[PDB]
Amino acid sequence: GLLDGKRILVSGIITDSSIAFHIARVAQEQGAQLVLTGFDRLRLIQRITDRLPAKAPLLELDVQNEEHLASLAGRVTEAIGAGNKLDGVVHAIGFMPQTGMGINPFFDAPYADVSKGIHISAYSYASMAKALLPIMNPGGSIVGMDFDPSRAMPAYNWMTVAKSALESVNRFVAREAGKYGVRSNLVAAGPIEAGAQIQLLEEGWDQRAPIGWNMKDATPVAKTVCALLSDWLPATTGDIIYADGGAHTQLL
Amino acid sequence: GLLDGKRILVSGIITDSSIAFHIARVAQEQGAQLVLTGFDRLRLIQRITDRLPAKAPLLELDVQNEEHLASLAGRVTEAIGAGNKLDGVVHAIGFMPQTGMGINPFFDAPYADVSKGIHISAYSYASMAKALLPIMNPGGSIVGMDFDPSRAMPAYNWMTVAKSALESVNRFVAREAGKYGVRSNLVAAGPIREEAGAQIQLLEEGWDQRAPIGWNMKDATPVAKTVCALLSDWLPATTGDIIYADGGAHTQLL
Amino acid sequence: GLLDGKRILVSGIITDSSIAFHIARVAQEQGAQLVLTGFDRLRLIQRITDRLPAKAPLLELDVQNEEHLASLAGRVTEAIGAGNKLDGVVHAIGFMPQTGMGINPFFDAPYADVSKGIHISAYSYASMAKALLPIMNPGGSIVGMDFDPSRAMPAYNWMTVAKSALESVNRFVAREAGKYGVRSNLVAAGPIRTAQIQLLEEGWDQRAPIGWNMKDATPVAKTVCALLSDWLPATTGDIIYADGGAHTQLL
Amino acid sequence: GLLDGKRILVSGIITDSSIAFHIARVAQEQGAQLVLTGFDRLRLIQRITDRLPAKAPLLELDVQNEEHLASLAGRVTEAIGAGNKLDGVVHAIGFMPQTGMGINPFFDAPYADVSKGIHISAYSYASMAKALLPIMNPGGSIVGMDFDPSRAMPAYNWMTVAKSALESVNRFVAREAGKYGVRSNLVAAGPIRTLAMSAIVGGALGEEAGAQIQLLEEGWDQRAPIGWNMKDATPVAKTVCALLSDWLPATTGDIIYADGGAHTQLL
Ligand SMILES: NC(=O)c1ccc[n+]([C@@H]2O[C@H](COP(=O)([O-])OP(=O)(O)OC[C@H]3O[C@@H](n4cnc5c(N)ncnc54)[C@H](O)[C@@H]3O)[C@@H](O)[C@H]2O)c1
Ligand SMILES: NC(=O)c1ccc[n+]([C@@H]2O[C@H](COP(=O)([O-])OP(=O)(O)OC[C@H]3O[C@@H](n4cnc5c(N)ncnc54)[C@H](O)[C@@H]3O)[C@@H](O)[C@H]2O)c1
Ligand SMILES: NC(=O)c1ccc[n+]([C@@H]2O[C@H](COP(=O)([O-])OP(=O)(O)OC[C@H]3O[C@@H](n4cnc5c(N)ncnc54)[C@H](O)[C@@H]3O)[C@@H](O)[C@H]2O)c1
Ligand SMILES: CC(C)[C@H]1OC(=O)[C@H](C)[C@H](O)[C@H](Cc2cccnc2)NC(=O)[C@@H](NC(=O)c2ncccc2O)[C@@H](C)OC1=O
């Protein structure tokens, strides 16, 4: 019972193979009471989140919608109880149009597309924190998903730029969260005619990781998120935890 | 004559108190032939660029207009000569609305404002490179201006996020520029000249104190010389990198 | 029961205010079976380890002593059982002569002193890992103690050089540990109390978004225990910062 | 010239092909007056330094010898002139016994060997700075040679640990040098094909070691946006000279990467 009696909001569940689905699954197994967030296909999300070990209320949240954000805190409290507060927040939201990641050349991505990607992947981490910090308990934890953007790589393109922005956003969210006695951290996960480029990237990851890396298994990264949601990392804030097999510490 | 016979495009001159003004001044002193770019007040910018040691053609460039960027290659070539190409490109444009930096709380900056800031301060480094790489010579150099965003600090707020984005953009611009035999680097400068006033005072005082060789905020010439060192042939194996012209303050805790 | 049924070797307990004592205390509370290591004042150390919630065998280990190394693991297996193996290793060993840190100028530290410091503070992480990896279970964890050496600072001097070496040693220990299915990580702690030393120690509290209490070693001990658990299984050759987030903030 | 009228101390010239030789060659071409340092094979180094474009005095310096360090400054001043001071120092000294790098397992390197390596590769950067800072002019520059140790890699082993120690030493040397108005920086070079490096590619260390280093060198050129030529030391020599010049005056305690941009690229 690592997360026993903790109220945790989990965003980004779209499929049963989503890291957010495994974070929610592992958190419930560890005794956490969950609140879930869905963006567009809510009835589809409801049917995915029915396969979770325990029942949890599903709330609508389009992170680009100002009204959804301004009402989020009220809707969460109605779902957990008038006098109850959140102990954790999981930001597992990421988006970049295909012009900004994949086959499309880096220079050919229009700003409107990259901006939408930065809005959803980086700015929204601050939006969700602004909306939920007033309904969070001291000793609380905000966890976001990152993909190590310290070095450029093919096909990830503008999504790497959005993750660099996200890391910087996290350092500032930590400053704001600190006032509430809440921690804010990121988990940098390993990977979970541009098909050849991503194959090269995935093969290289397992090769570099001293303990190896299984791309078809999201549970080691879900456990890391849960470790950050627990009271077992209480002096860690504005930081990045690498759940990538230790591949970022190895050149070859 | 560090930059002797080099054709260099310099963006971001609006006043003579700018780093872009000193980069242009130092580059001309080192024998570089310049092409200059201005945003809106071209009449006032032409008056400012007259304070530069030598004459240089002025071209209008609003980095948010895809019409100006598409034209750039054609406009720069007619200013330097039909058969001549650029040897250097200086990106010295940076903007963030006051909602994104200063006194305004970090959470109170609307996305439209932060997006405009990221567009001008980060995305435009890729826009300018896309437009100018086809008219650049091998051994060429693209330089951008940065402010170390690795750690959060007061007031800088969303400009720190835009600079983090710029660093990432630079690593990708290096990949594209490499195909032309062109280098792409950023120069991370130290600070250049009631609560907000006290915070910035603390940041500037701390910089000089941390810097092993000290830091003079009223002097932009050590950072302009660093940009010129990157525009030269003296750093030929450096790309996708950040050169710190901050007195060594980023390597020191206290 | 975060560490339930885990056999963990803990080094560096010399006092009741040491991080190593609190790691051992927290680990026992979480259901871990411990093996302890002592360097010199082993009679005094035994009287300190009696203040631990549960009984644990104390073994002699001078990290500069070649015979103590290589005899270590055989002595561990006799203490835990012939068929039992270790699940965790805590390296909480650090030393630098006063010529290498404090008031003495950086240039005035002789190599013999800095070398002794690097031997005990950095090289010994590889020595302890070499000796204990053959008696470690897959899913195992090796944890070392670090103090962020990425930037120079007053007084820390050659100890900063030894921690930079330690960080590099840990990336290589991870490569070796990986073939046993064992993780190797460092915990970079904020200042822990035991003018120039005072000024630095107060900066951390102001920079840390959640603040920093130098008189409390329990948040750093819990971080070590989180690394010893199965809750960070994809983390290796890494550094976890338990400094209140101070390293992510300029001011 | 870039270095016109500058007095520069250059250490580590042992072969007519090494980085220290090209630094010295490029510096002399740029108008620098040099002072050279030699380890043991003095008469051999003297005829290797005769290949340099201009004549330069050669001084004996065993970096592990306390007496050689204590007399250093006096010997340099006698070679340049009683009233003249040094404008630059180039530390191009690096050593690690084969127990600490190559085929030998990481855990099998004895401390005495790794310590000798750290003494020569890292500690000596501070030793040379201590000895030469009192005879250095303000605006001066100290440059050391590095190989990016931020990530572990095959064969480099304890030399990576010595290199990590060197970067930390450099940040503290910058603090000391700052008092004299002198900068201290490291140049992190990409892989350079030295006499030993060619031999390991040929298979002097075996098939496995030969394959590992080939993988490391091939990967470097592939990662480098502008490519990487291991047989050419001149781009790294020019970077050292850029740091010795007045064109990077606000850079200290830092690392300049002359590795083709490889360290900024994952793939
Ligand atoms: N898959 C990997 O290899 C990997 C590696 C590291 C990090 N990550 C990160 O993990 C997170 C989860 O992504 P994933 O890869 O598991 O895939 P995913 O498809 O499961 O998650 C992305 C989610 O973003 C949500 N989203 C998109 N636009 C939104 C909007 N406007 N409002 C609210 N939510 C919106 C979608 O509903 C979706 O659930 C992302 O931040 C991603 O960048 C993934
Ligand atoms: N001031 C400091 O303390 C400091 C420190 C480190 C780095 N820098 C950097 O130095 C660089 C030079 O700027 P500065 O310090 O002179 O400040 P600045 O306020 O003068 O920069 C604004 C510049 O951007 C241009 N610009 C704005 N919007 C534009 C648009 N849409 N299209 C095209 N051009 C546009 C303006 O014409 C102007 O030249 C900046 O990138 C800044 O971030 C400054
Ligand atoms: N104290 C702090 O503020 C702080 C901050 C960050 C990191 N750390 C690190 O944490 C570790 C332990 O810290 P602590 O608070 O317990 O202090 P400590 O004084 O108890 O740690 C030093 C230990 O080294 C041991 N030791 C010395 N020489 C030895 C040898 N030859 N063989 C074996 N052991 C030997 C001693 O027995 C002693 O317990 C150290 O490595 C230290 O650098 C401490
Ligand atoms: C056997 C094997 C480990 C081999 O490894 C390599 O060649 C690596 C992959 C790489 O190519 C770097 C590239 C380089 C060369 C020079 C400087 N910095 C980086 N080589 C070095 O680091 C080499 N160093 C020195 O010659 C040296 N000389 C002067 C000052 C410090 C010094 O460390 C040695 C230590 O290395 C080897 O022989």
Side-chain angles (χ1 to χ4, degrees), chain C residues 12-15 17-20 39 45 61-64 92-95 120 145-147 156 159 163 187 189-194:
Chain C
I13 308 161
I14 196 100
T15 61
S17 74
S18 278
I19 297 176
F39 159 54
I45 287 157
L61 178 66
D62 172 12
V63 105
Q64 292 195 97
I93 288 165
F95 174 79
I120 296 158
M145 299 315 116
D146 182 32
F147 190 63
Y156 210 67
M159 195 47 176
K163 295 299 185 178
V187 173
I192 296 295
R193 228 186 168 177
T194 40

mmCIF file of all heavy atoms in Angstrom, chain C residues 12-15 17-20 39 45 61-64 92-95 120 145-147 156 159 163 187 189-194, ligand 3:
data_model
loop_
_atom_site.group_PDB
_atom_site.id
_atom_site.type_symbol
_atom_site.label_atom_id
_atom_site.label_comp_id
_atom_site.label_asym_id
_atom_site.label_seq_id
_atom_site.Cartn_x
_atom_site.Cartn_y
_atom_site.Cartn_z
ATOM 1 N N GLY C 12 29.275 2.949 6.701
ATOM 2 C CA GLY C 12 29.450 4.317 7.180
ATOM 3 C C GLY C 12 28.757 4.789 8.445
ATOM 4 O O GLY C 12 28.701 6.001 8.669
ATOM 5 N N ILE C 13 28.223 3.878 9.290
ATOM 6 C CA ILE C 13 27.613 4.339 10.548
ATOM 7 C C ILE C 13 28.751 4.576 11.543
ATOM 8 O O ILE C 13 29.498 3.644 11.847
ATOM 9 C CB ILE C 13 26.481 3.439 11.139
ATOM 10 C CG1 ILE C 13 25.375 3.132 10.097
ATOM 11 C CG2 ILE C 13 25.879 4.088 12.409
ATOM 12 C CD1 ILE C 13 24.480 1.936 10.419
ATOM 13 N N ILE C 14 28.909 5.835 11.992
ATOM 14 C CA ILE C 14 29.931 6.266 12.954
ATOM 15 C C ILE C 14 29.266 7.022 14.134
ATOM 16 O O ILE C 14 29.753 6.931 15.260
ATOM 17 C CB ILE C 14 31.119 7.035 12.276
ATOM 18 C CG1 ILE C 14 32.356 7.146 13.190
ATOM 19 C CG2 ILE C 14 30.723 8.407 11.720
ATOM 20 C CD1 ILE C 14 33.445 6.140 12.896
ATOM 21 N N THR C 15 28.136 7.732 13.875
ATOM 22 C CA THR C 15 27.349 8.503 14.864
ATOM 23 C C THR C 15 25.825 8.310 14.691
ATOM 24 O O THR C 15 25.395 7.681 13.723
ATOM 25 C CB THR C 15 27.710 10.019 14.843
ATOM 26 O OG1 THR C 15 27.430 10.574 13.558
ATOM 27 C CG2 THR C 15 29.151 10.309 15.269
ATOM 28 N N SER C 17 23.738 10.899 14.346
ATOM 29 C CA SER C 17 23.317 11.988 13.458
ATOM 30 C C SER C 17 23.717 11.742 11.986
ATOM 31 O O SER C 17 23.393 12.567 11.133
ATOM 32 C CB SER C 17 23.854 13.333 13.954
ATOM 33 O OG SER C 17 25.244 13.478 13.720
ATOM 34 N N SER C 18 24.410 10.616 11.694
ATOM 35 C CA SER C 18 24.838 10.235 10.343
ATOM 36 C C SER C 18 23.665 9.782 9.470
ATOM 37 O O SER C 18 22.743 9.129 9.965
ATOM 38 C CB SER C 18 25.880 9.122 10.405
ATOM 39 O OG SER C 18 27.179 9.632 10.653
ATOM 40 N N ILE C 19 23.725 10.098 8.156
ATOM 41 C CA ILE C 19 22.720 9.704 7.161
ATOM 42 C C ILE C 19 22.625 8.178 7.125
ATOM 43 O O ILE C 19 21.520 7.636 7.093
ATOM 44 C CB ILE C 19 23.002 10.315 5.749
ATOM 45 C CG1 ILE C 19 22.943 11.853 5.773
ATOM 46 C CG2 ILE C 19 22.036 9.763 4.712
ATOM 47 C CD1 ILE C 19 23.299 12.574 4.437
ATOM 48 N N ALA C 20 23.789 7.495 7.187
ATOM 49 C CA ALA C 20 23.902 6.039 7.220
ATOM 50 C C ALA C 20 23.109 5.425 8.389
ATOM 51 O O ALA C 20 22.532 4.353 8.226
ATOM 52 C CB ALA C 20 25.363 5.640 7.305
ATOM 53 N N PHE C 39 34.478 0.990 10.118
ATOM 54 C CA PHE C 39 35.866 1.180 9.694
ATOM 55 C C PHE C 39 36.902 1.060 10.820
ATOM 56 O O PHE C 39 37.730 0.143 10.764
ATOM 57 C CB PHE C 39 36.030 2.514 8.920
ATOM 58 C CG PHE C 39 37.416 3.128 8.824
ATOM 59 C CD1 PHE C 39 38.495 2.393 8.340
ATOM 60 C CD2 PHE C 39 37.628 4.454 9.170
ATOM 61 C CE1 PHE C 39 39.770 2.963 8.260
ATOM 62 C CE2 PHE C 39 38.898 5.026 9.063
ATOM 63 C CZ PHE C 39 39.957 4.278 8.605
ATOM 64 N N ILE C 45 31.169 2.052 17.469
ATOM 65 C CA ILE C 45 30.189 1.855 16.394
ATOM 66 C C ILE C 45 29.103 0.863 16.858
ATOM 67 O O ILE C 45 27.916 1.123 16.662
ATOM 68 C CB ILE C 45 30.891 1.439 15.054
ATOM 69 C CG1 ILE C 45 31.644 2.642 14.426
ATOM 70 C CG2 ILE C 45 29.896 0.842 14.046
ATOM 71 C CD1 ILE C 45 32.805 2.283 13.448
ATOM 72 N N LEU C 61 35.295 -3.255 7.956
ATOM 73 C CA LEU C 61 35.653 -2.928 6.583
ATOM 74 C C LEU C 61 36.376 -1.592 6.460
ATOM 75 O O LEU C 61 35.768 -0.513 6.553
ATOM 76 C CB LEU C 61 34.443 -3.017 5.617
ATOM 77 C CG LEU C 61 34.696 -2.650 4.149
ATOM 78 C CD1 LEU C 61 35.639 -3.646 3.477
ATOM 79 C CD2 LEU C 61 33.387 -2.546 3.384
ATOM 80 N N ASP C 62 37.695 -1.688 6.276
ATOM 81 C CA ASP C 62 38.570 -0.568 5.977
ATOM 82 C C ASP C 62 38.657 -0.697 4.468
ATOM 83 O O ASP C 62 39.139 -1.701 3.940
ATOM 84 C CB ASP C 62 39.949 -0.699 6.655
ATOM 85 C CG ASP C 62 40.992 0.329 6.231
ATOM 86 O OD1 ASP C 62 40.622 1.321 5.567
ATOM 87 O OD2 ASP C 62 42.176 0.146 6.572
ATOM 88 N N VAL C 63 38.091 0.282 3.781
ATOM 89 C CA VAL C 63 37.955 0.304 2.341
ATOM 90 C C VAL C 63 39.317 0.412 1.610
ATOM 91 O O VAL C 63 39.402 0.036 0.442
ATOM 92 C CB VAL C 63 36.925 1.401 1.997
ATOM 93 C CG1 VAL C 63 37.551 2.665 1.431
ATOM 94 C CG2 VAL C 63 35.785 0.856 1.152
ATOM 95 N N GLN C 64 40.379 0.832 2.316
ATOM 96 C CA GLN C 64 41.743 0.908 1.763
ATOM 97 C C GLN C 64 42.510 -0.394 1.997
ATOM 98 O O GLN C 64 43.620 -0.561 1.482
ATOM 99 C CB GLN C 64 42.525 2.076 2.369
ATOM 100 C CG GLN C 64 42.001 3.434 1.955
ATOM 101 C CD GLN C 64 43.004 4.499 2.265
ATOM 102 O OE1 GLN C 64 43.781 4.918 1.398
ATOM 103 N NE2 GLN C 64 43.024 4.937 3.512
ATOM 104 N N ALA C 92 27.944 4.697 2.178
ATOM 105 C CA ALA C 92 27.834 5.996 2.833
ATOM 106 C C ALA C 92 29.190 6.324 3.462
ATOM 107 O O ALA C 92 29.299 6.679 4.628
ATOM 108 C CB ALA C 92 26.718 5.962 3.870
ATOM 109 N N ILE C 93 30.227 6.191 2.634
ATOM 110 C CA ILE C 93 31.631 6.400 2.975
ATOM 111 C C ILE C 93 32.153 7.614 2.203
ATOM 112 O O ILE C 93 31.995 7.678 0.989
ATOM 113 C CB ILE C 93 32.425 5.092 2.682
ATOM 114 C CG1 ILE C 93 32.088 3.999 3.717
ATOM 115 C CG2 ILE C 93 33.935 5.339 2.590
ATOM 116 C CD1 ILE C 93 32.530 2.582 3.324
ATOM 117 N N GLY C 94 32.732 8.563 2.932
ATOM 118 C CA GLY C 94 33.295 9.789 2.386
ATOM 119 C C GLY C 94 34.361 10.361 3.287
ATOM 120 O O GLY C 94 34.157 10.488 4.499
ATOM 121 N N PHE C 95 35.517 10.689 2.704
ATOM 122 C CA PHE C 95 36.634 11.258 3.450
ATOM 123 C C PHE C 95 37.506 12.121 2.580
ATOM 124 O O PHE C 95 37.754 11.787 1.432
ATOM 125 C CB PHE C 95 37.476 10.148 4.123
ATOM 126 C CG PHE C 95 38.733 10.634 4.811
ATOM 127 C CD1 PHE C 95 38.673 11.229 6.066
ATOM 128 C CD2 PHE C 95 39.971 10.535 4.185
ATOM 129 C CE1 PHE C 95 39.830 11.707 6.686
ATOM 130 C CE2 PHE C 95 41.129 11.001 4.812
ATOM 131 C CZ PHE C 95 41.053 11.582 6.058
ATOM 132 N N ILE C 120 38.995 6.699 -0.863
ATOM 133 C CA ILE C 120 37.900 6.428 0.077
ATOM 134 C C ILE C 120 36.548 6.932 -0.441
ATOM 135 O O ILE C 120 35.556 6.234 -0.304
ATOM 136 C CB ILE C 120 38.259 6.987 1.497
ATOM 137 C CG1 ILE C 120 39.488 6.253 2.097
ATOM 138 C CG2 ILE C 120 37.068 6.939 2.459
ATOM 139 C CD1 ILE C 120 40.276 7.007 3.192
ATOM 140 N N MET C 145 26.358 7.867 -1.696
ATOM 141 C CA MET C 145 26.008 9.224 -1.275
ATOM 142 C C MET C 145 26.886 10.231 -1.999
ATOM 143 O O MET C 145 28.101 10.067 -2.061
ATOM 144 C CB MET C 145 26.108 9.417 0.246
ATOM 145 C CG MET C 145 25.198 8.547 1.082
ATOM 146 S SD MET C 145 23.508 8.439 0.488
ATOM 147 C CE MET C 145 23.478 6.717 0.114
ATOM 148 N N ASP C 146 26.261 11.275 -2.535
ATOM 149 C CA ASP C 146 26.913 12.311 -3.328
ATOM 150 C C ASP C 146 26.534 13.704 -2.820
ATOM 151 O O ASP C 146 25.562 13.852 -2.084
ATOM 152 C CB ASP C 146 26.456 12.113 -4.803
ATOM 153 C CG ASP C 146 27.012 13.036 -5.876
ATOM 154 O OD1 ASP C 146 28.175 13.484 -5.737
ATOM 155 O OD2 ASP C 146 26.311 13.250 -6.895
ATOM 156 N N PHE C 147 27.309 14.711 -3.203
ATOM 157 C CA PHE C 147 27.030 16.121 -2.962
ATOM 158 C C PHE C 147 27.347 16.789 -4.287
ATOM 159 O O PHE C 147 28.505 16.764 -4.732
ATOM 160 C CB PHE C 147 27.861 16.705 -1.808
ATOM 161 C CG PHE C 147 27.415 18.088 -1.379
ATOM 162 C CD1 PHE C 147 26.141 18.296 -0.855
ATOM 163 C CD2 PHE C 147 28.282 19.168 -1.453
ATOM 164 C CE1 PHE C 147 25.741 19.565 -0.425
ATOM 165 C CE2 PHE C 147 27.877 20.440 -1.039
ATOM 166 C CZ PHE C 147 26.614 20.628 -0.518
ATOM 167 N N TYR C 156 34.375 23.304 -0.072
ATOM 168 C CA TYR C 156 34.243 21.902 -0.478
ATOM 169 C C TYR C 156 35.486 21.398 -1.251
ATOM 170 O O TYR C 156 35.889 20.261 -1.061
ATOM 171 C CB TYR C 156 32.920 21.661 -1.215
ATOM 172 C CG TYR C 156 32.378 20.256 -1.034
ATOM 173 C CD1 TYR C 156 31.936 19.809 0.213
ATOM 174 C CD2 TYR C 156 32.300 19.376 -2.109
ATOM 175 C CE1 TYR C 156 31.473 18.501 0.389
ATOM 176 C CE2 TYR C 156 31.826 18.072 -1.949
ATOM 177 C CZ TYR C 156 31.396 17.646 -0.704
ATOM 178 O OH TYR C 156 30.938 16.359 -0.560
ATOM 179 N N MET C 159 37.025 17.773 -2.220
ATOM 180 C CA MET C 159 35.934 16.840 -1.986
ATOM 181 C C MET C 159 34.963 16.906 -3.186
ATOM 182 O O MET C 159 34.399 15.879 -3.564
ATOM 183 C CB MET C 159 35.240 17.112 -0.638
ATOM 184 C CG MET C 159 34.331 15.973 -0.155
ATOM 185 S SD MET C 159 35.031 14.299 -0.226
ATOM 186 C CE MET C 159 33.745 13.378 0.497
ATOM 187 N N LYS C 163 33.781 13.883 -5.598
ATOM 188 C CA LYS C 163 32.366 13.591 -5.934
ATOM 189 C C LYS C 163 32.134 13.566 -7.446
ATOM 190 O O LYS C 163 31.274 12.827 -7.938
ATOM 191 C CB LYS C 163 31.375 14.538 -5.243
ATOM 192 C CG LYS C 163 31.349 14.411 -3.719
ATOM 193 C CD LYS C 163 30.942 13.022 -3.240
ATOM 194 C CE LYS C 163 30.820 12.962 -1.752
ATOM 195 N NZ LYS C 163 30.378 11.630 -1.304
ATOM 196 N N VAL C 187 22.672 9.275 -4.462
ATOM 197 C CA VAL C 187 21.701 10.225 -3.907
ATOM 198 C C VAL C 187 22.471 11.486 -3.613
ATOM 199 O O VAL C 187 23.409 11.437 -2.825
ATOM 200 C CB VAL C 187 20.907 9.714 -2.659
ATOM 201 C CG1 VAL C 187 20.046 10.825 -2.051
ATOM 202 C CG2 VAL C 187 20.034 8.527 -3.023
ATOM 203 N N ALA C 189 22.516 14.629 -1.755
ATOM 204 C CA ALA C 189 21.848 15.229 -0.612
ATOM 205 C C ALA C 189 22.179 16.706 -0.472
ATOM 206 O O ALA C 189 23.265 17.125 -0.860
ATOM 207 C CB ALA C 189 22.253 14.487 0.655
ATOM 208 N N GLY C 190 21.270 17.463 0.141
ATOM 209 C CA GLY C 190 21.530 18.848 0.509
ATOM 210 C C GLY C 190 22.444 18.846 1.735
ATOM 211 O O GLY C 190 22.770 17.768 2.254
ATOM 212 N N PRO C 191 22.901 20.013 2.248
ATOM 213 C CA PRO C 191 23.803 19.989 3.417
ATOM 214 C C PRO C 191 23.150 19.429 4.684
ATOM 215 O O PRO C 191 22.022 19.785 4.999
ATOM 216 C CB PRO C 191 24.243 21.451 3.569
ATOM 217 C CG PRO C 191 23.201 22.248 2.891
ATOM 218 C CD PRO C 191 22.628 21.390 1.801
ATOM 219 N N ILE C 192 23.838 18.498 5.360
ATOM 220 C CA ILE C 192 23.377 17.846 6.592
ATOM 221 C C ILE C 192 24.325 18.250 7.728
ATOM 222 O O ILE C 192 25.533 18.039 7.606
ATOM 223 C CB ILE C 192 23.246 16.299 6.407
ATOM 224 C CG1 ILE C 192 22.156 15.918 5.360
ATOM 225 C CG2 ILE C 192 23.044 15.549 7.748
ATOM 226 C CD1 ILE C 192 20.641 16.277 5.697
ATOM 227 N N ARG C 193 23.790 18.903 8.788
ATOM 228 C CA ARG C 193 24.585 19.383 9.921
ATOM 229 C C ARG C 193 25.122 18.268 10.820
ATOM 230 O O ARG C 193 24.413 17.295 11.112
ATOM 231 C CB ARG C 193 23.825 20.421 10.741
ATOM 232 C CG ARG C 193 24.678 21.651 11.033
ATOM 233 C CD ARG C 193 23.976 22.622 11.959
ATOM 234 N NE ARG C 193 24.892 23.645 12.466
ATOM 235 C CZ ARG C 193 24.524 24.650 13.255
ATOM 236 N NH1 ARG C 193 23.257 24.785 13.623
ATOM 237 N NH2 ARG C 193 25.421 25.533 13.675
ATOM 238 N N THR C 194 26.400 18.429 11.244
ATOM 239 C CA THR C 194 27.166 17.506 12.093
ATOM 240 C C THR C 194 28.079 18.290 13.042
ATOM 241 O O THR C 194 28.774 19.216 12.619
ATOM 242 C CB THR C 194 27.982 16.510 11.240
ATOM 243 O OG1 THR C 194 28.541 17.186 10.112
ATOM 244 C CG2 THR C 194 27.161 15.310 10.782
HETATM 245 N N1 LIG E 3 27.042 15.304 5.735
HETATM 246 C C1 LIG E 3 26.496 15.974 4.707
HETATM 247 O O1 LIG E 3 26.118 17.148 4.806
HETATM 248 C C2 LIG E 3 26.418 15.277 3.370
HETATM 249 C C3 LIG E 3 25.900 15.916 2.248
HETATM 250 C C4 LIG E 3 25.918 15.281 1.020
HETATM 251 C C5 LIG E 3 26.478 14.023 0.914
HETATM 252 N N2 LIG E 3 27.001 13.417 1.997
HETATM 253 C C6 LIG E 3 27.858 12.126 1.900
HETATM 254 O O2 LIG E 3 27.226 11.117 2.627
HETATM 255 C C7 LIG E 3 28.219 10.187 3.121
HETATM 256 C C8 LIG E 3 27.974 9.912 4.582
HETATM 257 O O3 LIG E 3 27.586 11.142 5.230
HETATM 258 P P1 LIG E 3 27.331 11.194 6.803
HETATM 259 O O4 LIG E 3 26.415 12.318 7.101
HETATM 260 O O5 LIG E 3 26.964 9.836 7.267
HETATM 261 O O6 LIG E 3 28.798 11.542 7.343
HETATM 262 P P2 LIG E 3 29.963 10.634 7.943
HETATM 263 O O7 LIG E 3 30.975 11.474 8.634
HETATM 264 O O8 LIG E 3 29.318 9.679 8.957
HETATM 265 O O9 LIG E 3 30.578 9.727 6.710
HETATM 266 C C9 LIG E 3 31.976 9.409 6.578
HETATM 267 C C10 LIG E 3 32.145 7.935 6.847
HETATM 268 O O10 LIG E 3 33.287 7.425 6.129
HETATM 269 C C11 LIG E 3 33.728 6.287 6.826
HETATM 270 N N3 LIG E 3 35.083 5.957 6.390
HETATM 271 C C12 LIG E 3 36.178 6.779 6.342
HETATM 272 N N4 LIG E 3 37.274 6.185 5.932
HETATM 273 C C13 LIG E 3 36.873 4.880 5.696
HETATM 274 C C14 LIG E 3 37.563 3.744 5.228
HETATM 275 N N5 LIG E 3 38.871 3.729 4.954
HETATM 276 N N6 LIG E 3 36.851 2.603 5.058
HETATM 277 C C15 LIG E 3 35.544 2.609 5.332
HETATM 278 N N7 LIG E 3 34.791 3.610 5.795
HETATM 279 C C16 LIG E 3 35.522 4.727 5.961
HETATM 280 C C17 LIG E 3 33.596 6.645 8.304
HETATM 281 O O11 LIG E 3 33.473 5.470 9.100
HETATM 282 C C18 LIG E 3 32.346 7.549 8.316
HETATM 283 O O12 LIG E 3 31.183 6.880 8.785
HETATM 284 C C19 LIG E 3 29.589 10.765 2.762
HETATM 285 O O13 LIG E 3 30.143 10.118 1.620
HETATM 286 C C20 LIG E 3 29.282 12.232 2.462
HETATM 287 O O14 LIG E 3 30.228 12.779 1.551
HETATM 288 C C21 LIG E 3 26.936 14.001 3.222
#
